UniProtKB/Swiss-Prot annotation:
GO-annotated molecular function: calcium ion binding; calcium-dependent phospholipid binding; phosphatidylserine binding; phospholipase inhibitor activity; phospholipid binding
Residues bearing PTM Phosphoserine: S35
Organism: Homo sapiens
Function, in words: This protein is an anticoagulant protein that acts as an indirect inhibitor of the thromboplastin-specific complex, which is involved in the blood coagulation cascade.
Cross-linked sites for Glycyl lysine isopeptide (Lys-Gly) (interchain with G-Cter in SUMO2): K27
Positions bearing N6-succinyllysine: K288
The encoding gene: ANXA5
Cross-link (Glycyl lysine isopeptide (Lys-Gly) (interchain with G-Cter in SUMO1)) at residue(s): K27
Entry's disease: Pregnancy loss, recurrent, 3: A common complication of pregnancy, resulting in spontaneous abortion before the fetus has reached viability. The term includes all miscarriages from the time of conception until 24 weeks of gestation. Recurrent pregnancy loss is defined as 3 or more consecutive spontaneous abortions.
Quaternary structure and interacting proteins, as annotated: Monomer. Binds ATRX and EIF5B. Interacts with hepatitis B virus (HBV).
Protein name: Annexin A5
Family membership noted in the UniProt record: Belongs to the annexin family.
Length: 318
């Protein structure tokens, strides 16, 4: 594993040229959504920021206010996601799950499960800088119970460092998890939230081995993904991220298209948020694990400029 994304710095970029092109495409009645799509999906995020800066000095206009007026639908919500400064997209996405749009634990479980404690400190820092309130307090307001408790544990970003691995506490933790999991994760929540939340990744992947020997099964089996119980799902997410974030994230995209529905808000979020970080890796797991390329799935569930961009993000190569 070399963490890679799918979007890189466009070579021989001209932020002025870029911005002018993008002025013609809005310009007049009609929109050149292809021209808009192809350009910004073929640019990285920092670059997109230079083009907004250039669009303003040139024309005296707000690039994003113009995109927000020209566009609709999901291709709008996609473009608008592209133009989010990477530093912000996650906390933007946390804010909105918390504002308005009622019950959105799916989003909270996704980010806070699947970010590295270095990602979690910055998010907390930026949100509290952008929106004025603390993420942790906002989460406490809008959540309840152990699901809340666990998130607030996860939000501390304070796991045991990977160092020496204590085979005795690996035995003790896999016990606690054994029994609690045939208690339906339904008893002694305080005890398992401390193990899931504070232990090291390298310690936990060992505990998870130590379960599959003692119980003959792997700890996932003991939960249902379809059935609710935010905690169980949060639990389940942690067990999958502790094993492998790009694999968790490739499974999140895969059930975003499963059945009736394409859960576009999950689609947009992952593609975009991981695009310059690990989107490569997420492909190279989806293929192998789900046996179809991500590309073609998306080419399949989606349609329009929205799938043009999305495919353009994904990249048809490896
Ligand atoms: Ca127009
Ligand atoms: Ca709400
Ligand atoms: Ca579908």
């Amino acid at each position: 594993q070399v963490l890679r994304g799918t979007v890189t710095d466009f070579p021989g970029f001209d932020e002025r040229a870029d911005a002018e092109t993008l002025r013609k495409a809005m310009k007049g009645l009609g929109t050149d959504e292809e021209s808009i799509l192809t350009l910004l999906t073929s640019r990285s995020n920092a670059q997109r920021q230079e083009i907004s800066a250039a669009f303003k000095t040139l024309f005296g206009r707000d690039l994003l206010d113009d995109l927000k007026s020209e566009l609709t639908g999901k291709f709008e919500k996609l473009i608008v996601a592209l133009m989010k400064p990477s530093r912000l997209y996650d906390a933007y996405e946390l804010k909105h799950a918390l504002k308005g749009a009622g019950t959105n634990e799916k989003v909270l479980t996704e980010i806070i499960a699947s970010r590295t404690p270095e990602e979690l400190r910055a998010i907390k820092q930026v949100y509290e800088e952008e929106y004025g309130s603390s993420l942790e307090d906002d989460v406490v307001g809008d959540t309840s119970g152990y699901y809340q408790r666990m998130l607030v544990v996860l939000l501390q970003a304070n796991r045991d460092p990977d160092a020496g691995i204590d085979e005795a506490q690996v035995e003790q933790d896999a016990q606690a998890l054994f029994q609690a999991g045939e208690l339906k994760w339904g008893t002694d929540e305080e005890k398992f939230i401390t193990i899931f939340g504070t232990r090291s990744v390298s310690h936990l992947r060992k505990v998870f081995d130590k379960y599959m020997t003692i119980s003959g099964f792997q700890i996932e089996e003991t939960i249902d993904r379809e059935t609710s119980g935010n905690l169980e799902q949060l639990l389940l997410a942690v067990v999958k991220s502790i094993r492998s974030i790009p694999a968790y994230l490739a499974e999140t995209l895969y059930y975003a298209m499963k059945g009736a529905g394409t859960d576009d808000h999950t689609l947009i979020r992952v593609m975009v948020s991981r695009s310059e970080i690990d989107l490569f890796n997420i492909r190279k797991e989806f293929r192998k694990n789900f046996a179809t390329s991500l590309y073609s799935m998306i080419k399949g569930d989606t349609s329009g400029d929205y799938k043009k961009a999305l495919l353009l993000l994904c990249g048809e190569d490896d």
